[PDB]
Amino acid sequence: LCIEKERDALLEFKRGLSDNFGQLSTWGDEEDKKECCKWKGIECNKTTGHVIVLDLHNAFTCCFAPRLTGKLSPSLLELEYLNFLDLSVNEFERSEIPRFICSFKRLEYLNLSSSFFSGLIPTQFKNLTSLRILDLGYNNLIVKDLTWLSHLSSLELLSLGGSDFQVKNWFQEITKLPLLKELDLSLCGLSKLVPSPAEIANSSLISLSVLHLCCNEFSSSAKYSWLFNFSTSLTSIDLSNNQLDGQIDDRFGNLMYLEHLNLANELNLKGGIPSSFGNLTRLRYLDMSNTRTYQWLPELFVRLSGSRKTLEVLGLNDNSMFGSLVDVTRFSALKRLYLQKNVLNGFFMERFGQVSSLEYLDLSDNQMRGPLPDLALFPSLRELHLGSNHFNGRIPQGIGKLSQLKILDVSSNRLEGLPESMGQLSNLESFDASYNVLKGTITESHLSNLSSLVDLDLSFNSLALKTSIDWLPPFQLQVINLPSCNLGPSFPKWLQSQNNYTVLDISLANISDALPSWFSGLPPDIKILNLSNNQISGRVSDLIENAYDYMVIDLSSNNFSGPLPLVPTNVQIFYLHKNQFFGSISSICKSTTGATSLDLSHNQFSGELPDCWMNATNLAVLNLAYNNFSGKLPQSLGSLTNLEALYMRQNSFSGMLPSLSQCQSLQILDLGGNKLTGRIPAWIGTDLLNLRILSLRFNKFYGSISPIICQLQFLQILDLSANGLAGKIPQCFNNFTLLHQENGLGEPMEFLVQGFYGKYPRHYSYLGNLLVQWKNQEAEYKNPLTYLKTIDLSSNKLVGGIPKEMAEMRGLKSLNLSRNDLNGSIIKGIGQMKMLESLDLSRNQLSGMIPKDLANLTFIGVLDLSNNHLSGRIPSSTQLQTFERSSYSGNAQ
Ligand SMILES: *[C@@H]1O[C@H](CO)[C@@H](O[C@@H]2O[C@H](CO)[C@@H](O[C@@H]3O[C@H](CO[C@H]4O[C@H](CO[C@H]5O[C@H](CO)[C@@H](O)[C@H](O)[C@@H]5O[C@H]5O[C@H](CO)[C@@H](O)[C@H](O)[C@@H]5O)[C@@H](O)[C@H](O[C@H]5O[C@H](CO)[C@@H](O)[C@H](O)[C@@H]5O)[C@@H]4O)[C@@H](O)[C@H](O[C@H]4O[C@H](CO)[C@@H](O)[C@H](O)[C@@H]4O)[C@@H]3O)[C@H](O)[C@H]2NC(C)=O)[C@H](O)[C@H]1NC(C)=O
Numbered sequence: 055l056c057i058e059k060e061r062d063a064l065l066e067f068k069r070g071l072s073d074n075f076g077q078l079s080t081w082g083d084e085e086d087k088k089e090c091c092k093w094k095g096i097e098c099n100k101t102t103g104h105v106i107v108l109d110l111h112n113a114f115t116c117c118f119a120p121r122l123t124g125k126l127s128p129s130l131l132e133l134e135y136l137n138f139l140d141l142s143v144n145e146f147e148r149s150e151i152p153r154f155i156c157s158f159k160r161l162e163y164l165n166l167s168s169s170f171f172s173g174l175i176p177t178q179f180k181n182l183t184s185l186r187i188l189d190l191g192y193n194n195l196i197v198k199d200l201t202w203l204s205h206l207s208s209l210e211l212l213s214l215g216g217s218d219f220q221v222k223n224w225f226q227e228i229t230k231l232p233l234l235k236e237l238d239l240s241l242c243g244l245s246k247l248v249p250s251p252a253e254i255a256n257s258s259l260i261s262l263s264v265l266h267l268c269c270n271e272f273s274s275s276a277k278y279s280w281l282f283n284f285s286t287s288l289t290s291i292d293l294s295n296n297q298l299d300g301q302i303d304d305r306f307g308n309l310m311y312l313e314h315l316n317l318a319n320e321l322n323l324k325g326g327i328p329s330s331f332g333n334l335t336r337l338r339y340l341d342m343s344n345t346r347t348y349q350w351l352p353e354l355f356v357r358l359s360g361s362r363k364t365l366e367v368l369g370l371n372d373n374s375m376f377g378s379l380v381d382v383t384r385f386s387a388l389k390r391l392y393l394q395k396n397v398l399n400g401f402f403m404e405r406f407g408q409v410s411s412l413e414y415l416d417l418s419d420n421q422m423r424g425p426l427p428d429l430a431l432f433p434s435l436r437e438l439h440l441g442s443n444h445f446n447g448r449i450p451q452g453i454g455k456l457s458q459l460k461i462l463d464v465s466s467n468r469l470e471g472l473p474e475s476m477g478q479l480s481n482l483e484s485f486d487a488s489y490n491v492l493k494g495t496i497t498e499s500h501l502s503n504l505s506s507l508v509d510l511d512l513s514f515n516s517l518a519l520k521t522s523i524d525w526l527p528p529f530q531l532q533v534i535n536l537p538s539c540n541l542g543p544s545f546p547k548w549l550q551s552q553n554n555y556t557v558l559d560i561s562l563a564n565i566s567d568a569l570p571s572w573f574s575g576l577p578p579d580i581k582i583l584n585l586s587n588n589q590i591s592g593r594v595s596d597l598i599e600n601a602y603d604y605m606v607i608d609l610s611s612n613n614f615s616g617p618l619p620l621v622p623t624n625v626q627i628f629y630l631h632k633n634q635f636f637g638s639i640s641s642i643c644k645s646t647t648g649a650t651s652l653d654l655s656h657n658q659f660s661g662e663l664p665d666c667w668m669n670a671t672n673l674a675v676l677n678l679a680y681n682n683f684s685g686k687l688p689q690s691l692g693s694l695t696n697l698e699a700l701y702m703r704q705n706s707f708s709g710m711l712p713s714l715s716q717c718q719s720l721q722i723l724d725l726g727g728n729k730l731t732g733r734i735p736a737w738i739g740t741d742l743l744n745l746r747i748l749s750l751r752f753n754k755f756y757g758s759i760s761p762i763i764c765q766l767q768f769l770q771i772l773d774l775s776a777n778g779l780a781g782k783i784p785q786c787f788n789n790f791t792l793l794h795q796e797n798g799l800g801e802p803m804e805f806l807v808q809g810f811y812g813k814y815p816r817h818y819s820y821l822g823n824l825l826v827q828w829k830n831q832e833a834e835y836k837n838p839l840t841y842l843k844t845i846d847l848s849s850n851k852l853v854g855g856i857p858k859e860m861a862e863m864r865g866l867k868s869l870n871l872s873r874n875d876l877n878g879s880i881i882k883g884i885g886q887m888k889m890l891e892s893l894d895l896s897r898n899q900l901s902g903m904i905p906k907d908l909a910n911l912t913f914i915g916v917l918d919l920s921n922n923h924l925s926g927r928i929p930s931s932t933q934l935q936t937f938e939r940s941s942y943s944g945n946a947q
């Protein structure tokens with residue numbers, strides 16, 4: 055039975071507020087909304103409709119809060135009877151607290167916290183003599199006096215947090231509150247306001263049970279000593295983020311009735327809990343996270359033995375702790391245990407036989423040893439984390455008795471098997487056992503009733519999953535990571551029932567079956583598809599479909615055939631090498647693509663490269679090697695601003711290559727074995743400042759090697775063998791940096807792709823190394839030896855002599871100047887070379903006598919000086935005599 059005056063007042067209050075988030079929507083002048091009892095946020099007395107509770111609060115959803123923004127109209131005074139006013143996280147006019155709140159005459163609850171109220175506290179709050187709970191904390195209020203607090207003699211809770219606290223004699227004022235029981239002075243300085251012993255003596259008797267004293271820069275035991283003389287009645291004590299240093303006070307023991315001790319995020323709590331804590335017998339929550347305890351765990355548990363039957367949640371994570379966890383079932387009341395990221399180095403043994411009550415256990419990111427305990431003694435575990443440890447032995451058969459586990463992570467251990475009871479789990483939403491040993495075979499019996507599995511990760515184990523035919527899986531799992539798992543000679547037939555997965559990883563399996571017809575279309579939202587290193591055959595033309603969340607498509611090392619699959623818009627890495635594709639790739643830039651890496655090597659494609667690459671903006675690696683293309687290179691190859699590596703070796707192109715002047719940030723450019731023609735590009739030296747690998751072998755070039763090529767100053771590989779070049783060898787090889795510092799190494803040649811792909815979040819991070827890719831590619835050419843620092847100018851019409859500047863070169867590991875026409879004597883000063891492992895100067899018109907310094911070379915592996923007009927008396931050295939007669943043949947010495 056609402057009073058029309060109160061309803062009009064409420065409407066007037068609403069008029070001044072801009073409720074832009076749907077709150078206060080039930081309010082209004084409409085006829086169907088007349089009765090104010092169902093009006094949201096409003097409660098009324100049944101005998102008479104006077105408003106009692108007005109709680110327009112909100113909450114943080116993750117931050118973000120659906121805050122109101124208006125102005126407190128003074129019409130609320132018409133309510134005349136309310137005893138509850140909650141404005142908890144709203145942001146009204148960022149001004150002083152309204153001065154009419156003092157004239158309510160019946161309030162028993164005021165929560166103006168977590169707003170942006172500013173200014174001082176009005177002095178009229180002395181009229182609020184009937185309050186019981188006051189919460190003005192975490193505002194922008196500035197307090198300098200507390201004389202009003204004396205009149206408010208009926209409070210049981212006071213929270214003035216977040217204030218610019220400057221009241222020096224706060225203890226005297228607070229102690230004048232006989233009925234006070236909870237005090238929140240968080241983030242209020244209070245380290246510069248320490249009551250003297252005279253002030254403490256000149257104080258009344260108050261039994262404060264709960265204290266919130268966090269975010270105060272105490273940093274010492276003497277600053278907070280006063281709380282220890284409310285010892286007769288204390289229940290909860292929060293002292294987090296005070297930068298405390300030294301041993302925790304021994305007086306925290308013998309502090310009976312304590313049920314909570316938040317000591318999170320201190321500086322150095324050296325030594326951990328003292329011997330005085332064997333007297334507690336009532337502890338229920340002890341958080342000592344991020345405090346650097348360095349305590350022995352059995353000692354910690356024997357010091358907590360008093361509260362064995364009462365302790366519920368225990369912290370002790372992110373701090374140094376050593377020992378072994380033994381006899382945890384004797385607590386019989388512990389519910390949550392977080393011993394992660396410690397320096398534990400012991401076993402995990404029960405030995406006691408009684409049942410536990412753990413619901414959340416996390417022993418991850420530390421060291422453990424020995425087998426897992428009999429897990430049937432934890433029939434209430436909800437989230438078991440045991441990863442990043444050293445756990446051996448088979449997973450116990452009792453794992454099927456949990457019957458309530460949701461997340462199981464046993465990765466990075468040394469587990470040797472997986473039991474058959476795992477199937478009877480019916481709420482396991484995420485199973486992760488990657489990077490274990492896990493030998494054996496998995497039958498459908500291991501997955502019979504896994505009805506709620508949405509994440510299965512048996513990554514990189516010597517495992518074998520072989521499900522019998524006519525098995526209908528009971529789960530529609532989102533993430534399928536099964537690399538290096540034998541999934542049967544045929545294509546796994548349990549994927550037919552799956553039509554919602556977003557990440558699929560069937561790589562490194564053993565599949566030698568043609569692609570099934572039912573594997574037509576992937577689920578619309580797919581992010582990772584890695585079918586690499588298998589023997590799958592068929593056409594993948596009608597499987598891509600151009601989704602919107604594609605990130606990885608790796609179909610490398612298979613027996614695929616047919617036309618090129620479509621390249622989606624949002625893909626970042628597109629790998630297709632080691633396949634049997636054929637046709638034309640003209641459909642590769644028809645749409646805007648954002649691929650960082652594009653691999654089409656070791657295939658049998660054909661046709662001219664389309665003039666399409668103007669649409670490619672983010673290509674960093676383009677590898678079209680060993681593919682038998684033809685025609686002129688596209689003029690759009692210069693539009694790739696962010697191009698790093700370009701592989702086009704062994705493809706039989708033609709014509710003068712186009713300018714890639716805009717292609718700065720280019721590091722690898724190999725075009726060997728094709729039919730490219732023309733003079734050496736002038737733009738190689740001018741632009742391309744970050745070039746390190748340049749290979750142009752077995753092409754139809756000509757002309758002089760222009761000296762500008764010396765300006766690269768990062769070149770470690772220069773391949774110009776069998777190209778028909780002529781003239782004189784450049785006299786500027788010192789200009790190269792990495793071949794002048796002996797053991798110097800260049801900056802890493804890396805590219806990175808990152809993403810998140812799980813409801814239970816997981817990080818996908820691929821780091822491709824260009825130099826590793828070059829090493830892998832070069833294994834196809836030279837079986838004997840390859841080197842990462844090589845200068846090659848063999849088999850050309852070069853004339854003149856070797857300039858006397860390679861003697862100063864230090865880190866060069868290979869040198870091949872053969873089948874040229876070189877006149878004169880070999881470099882006098884060759885002994886200055888240190889890390890030479892190969893040297894060839896065969897088939898040349900060399901004249902002179904081999905210098906004695908050749909004797910003091912050290913690590914030369916292969917040497918050839920055949921077919922030269924040289925002198926005799928080969929130097930008597932250590933490894934020189936180890937070479938055969940072939941290396942010095944064909945000479946008239
Ligand atoms: C005046 O008004 C203001 C309004 O602004 C009032 O202030 C509000 O008061 C209410 C109380 O009614 C508060 O709600 C309560 O919040 C608490 C705290 O929840 C938060 O912490 C939880 C625990 O976090 C630890 O543990 C987790 C792992 O479990 C870890 O990830 C955390 O990082 C943290 O870890 C730390 O501690 C570990 C163990 O000690 C250590 O190992 C570790 O190293 C760390 O040191 C957390 O679970 C919780 O998360 C919730 O929210 C997220 C996101 O929304 C969601 O995903 C989760 O699932 C959770 O839902 C919070 O981060 C909470 O414990 C209370 O729970 C009660 O209510 C629920 C209701 O269902 C019951 O089920 C519970 O059993 C329990 O009874 C309650 O929700 C509110 O937070 C607070 N808000 C503000 C802004 O102040 C004020 O009280 C009013 N004044 C007066 C006088 O009343």
Ligand SMILES: *[C@@H]1O[C@H](CO)[C@@H](O[C@@H]2O[C@H](CO)[C@@H](O[C@@H]3O[C@H](CO[C@H]4O[C@H](CO)[C@@H](O)[C@H](O)[C@@H]4O)[C@@H](O)[C@H](O[C@H]4O[C@H](CO)[C@@H](O)[C@H](O)[C@@H]4O)[C@@H]3O)[C@H](O)[C@H]2NC(C)=O)[C@H](O)[C@H]1NC(C)=O
Nearest residue numbers: 489537538559561562584585586587606607608627629820
């Ligand atoms: C599609 O799927 C295939 C198959 O799964 C992927 O190819 C494999 O990718 C993984 C992940 O990158 C590779 O595993 C890694 O190999 C690195 C190199 O291995 C050599 O060096 C190590 C150390 O010297 C030797 O022991 C080893 O025998 C090799 O000689 C390792 O260094 C990596 O180990 C590091 O990471 C793991 C996991 O974080 C840690 O546990 C380790 O302690 C260490 O820190 C790792 O093992 C694997 O080599 C690849 N195999 C093949 C055949 O390519 C494709 O990458 C995937 N496609 C895409 C796009 O992701």
Ligand SMILES: *[C@@H]1O[C@H](CO)[C@@H](O[C@@H]2O[C@H](CO)[C@@H](O[C@@H]3O[C@H](CO)[C@@H](O)[C@H](O)[C@@H]3O)[C@H](O)[C@H]2NC(C)=O)[C@H](O)[C@H]1NC(C)=O
Nearest residue numbers: 775776847848849869870871872873892893894916917918
């Ligand atoms: C420096 O580069 C030249 C080429 O630029 C390398 O010459 C190659 O050397 C191999 C090994 O001797 C030759 O193979 C030979 O093939 C014939 C058959 O034709 C066989 O009878 C020989 O026994 C030998 O296997 C290869 O033909 C030759 N390339 C040529 C002549 O074009 C040379 O090896 C490089 N030097 C170093 C140290 O690597």
Ligand SMILES: *[C@@H]1O[C@H](CO)[C@@H](O[C@@H]2O[C@H](CO)[C@@H](O)[C@H](O)[C@H]2NC(C)=O)[C@H](O)[C@H]1NC(C)=O
Nearest residue numbers: 304305307308309328329330331332333334360
């Ligand atoms: C735990 O509480 C007991 C008292 O219940 C403490 O014992 C006191 O101190 C010594 C024991 O070494 C004896 O004089 C008496 O047993 C007690 N003296 C009193 C009550 O005046 C015991 O010291 C406490 N534990 C710790 C570690 O201090």
Ligand SMILES: *[C@@H]1O[C@H](CO)[C@@H](O[C@@H]2O[C@H](CO)[C@@H](O)[C@H](O)[C@H]2NC(C)=O)[C@H](O)[C@H]1NC(C)=O
Nearest residue numbers: 643644645646647664665666667668669670690
């Ligand atoms: C680069 O991509 C753009 C957009 O994807 C292509 O331009 C569109 O091409 C389609 C297909 O022929 C036409 O239907 C649109 O009308 C085109 N729009 C515009 C604004 O041109 C473009 O053809 C691609 N580049 C090359 C060289 O083909």
Ligand SMILES: *[C@@H]1O[C@H](CO)[C@@H](O)[C@H](O)[C@H]1NC(C)=O
Nearest residue numbers: 098099100101102104106137
């Ligand atoms: C409702 O009003 C009556 C008389 O005015 C009072 O006795 C009673 O306590 C009120 N109810 C509440 C919940 O305040």
Ligand SMILES: *[C@@H]1O[C@H](CO)[C@@H](O)[C@H](O)[C@H]1NC(C)=O
Nearest residue numbers: 153156157178179180181182
């Ligand atoms: C507080 O109560 C006294 C008692 O009558 C009254 O005189 C005074 O005006 C009240 N304060 C305010 C701000 O109304």
Ligand SMILES: *[C@@H]1O[C@H](CO)[C@@H](O)[C@H](O)[C@H]1NC(C)=O
Nearest residue numbers: 251254255256257279282283
């Ligand atoms: C309260 O305890 C402190 C801590 O030792 C002590 O110095 C002070 O004299 C005590 N005062 C009263 C009134 O109990």
Ligand SMILES: *[C@@H]1O[C@H](CO)[C@@H](O)[C@H](O)[C@H]1NC(C)=O
Nearest residue numbers: 223226227252253255256257
């Ligand atoms: C000490 O206590 C007496 C007792 O009433 C009081 O009058 C006096 O003001 C107190 N001293 C201080 C500094 O408050």
Ligand SMILES: *[C@@H]1O[C@H](CO)[C@@H](O)[C@H](O)[C@H]1NC(C)=O
Nearest residue numbers: 477478479480502503504505
């Ligand atoms: C577990 O699987 C068996 C085999 O069909 C079934 O009979 C049983 O009902 C399942 N348990 C459930 C659904 O709780």
Ligand SMILES: *[C@@H]1O[C@H](CO)[C@@H](O)[C@H](O)[C@H]1NC(C)=O
Nearest residue numbers: 508530532553554555577813
């Ligand atoms: C796939 O799962 C998502 C949630 O993970 C759900 O919203 C969607 O409806 C599912 N798809 C189908 C076809 O049920």
Ligand SMILES: *[C@@H]1O[C@H](CO)[C@@H](O)[C@H](O)[C@H]1NC(C)=O
Nearest residue numbers: 540543562563564565587588
């Ligand atoms: C599966 O293929 C790998 C490829 O390296 C091979 O080493 C392994 O022996 C194969 N296993 C079976 C069972 O065929």
Ligand SMILES: *[C@@H]1O[C@H](CO)[C@@H](O)[C@H](O)[C@H]1NC(C)=O
Nearest residue numbers: 566589590591612613632633
């Ligand atoms: C797939 O290709 C490899 C080598 O490219 C070949 O050895 C294998 O026989 C091929 N598989 C089939 C089914 O033809």
Ligand SMILES: *[C@@H]1O[C@H](CO)[C@@H](O)[C@H](O)[C@H]1NC(C)=O
Nearest residue numbers: 764765766767786788789790
């Ligand atoms: C020598 O090489 C450096 C390396 O960048 C270059 O800056 C310098 O101009 C070169 N000197 C010449 C080509 O005379």
Ligand SMILES: *[C@@H]1O[C@H](CO)[C@@H](O)[C@H](O)[C@H]1NC(C)=O
Nearest residue numbers: 782853854855875876877878
């Ligand atoms: C050696 O060959 C070079 C070719 O330019 C040139 O110096 C000359 O023709 C020859 N003889 C001498 C002594 O250099």
Ligand SMILES: *[C@@H]1O[C@H](CO)[C@@H](O)[C@H](O)[C@H]1NC(C)=O
Nearest residue numbers: 885886906907908909910911
């Ligand atoms: C190598 O030996 C020769 C001896 O003829 C010497 O002149 C030269 O300095 C040596 N090189 C070194 C020590 O690096």
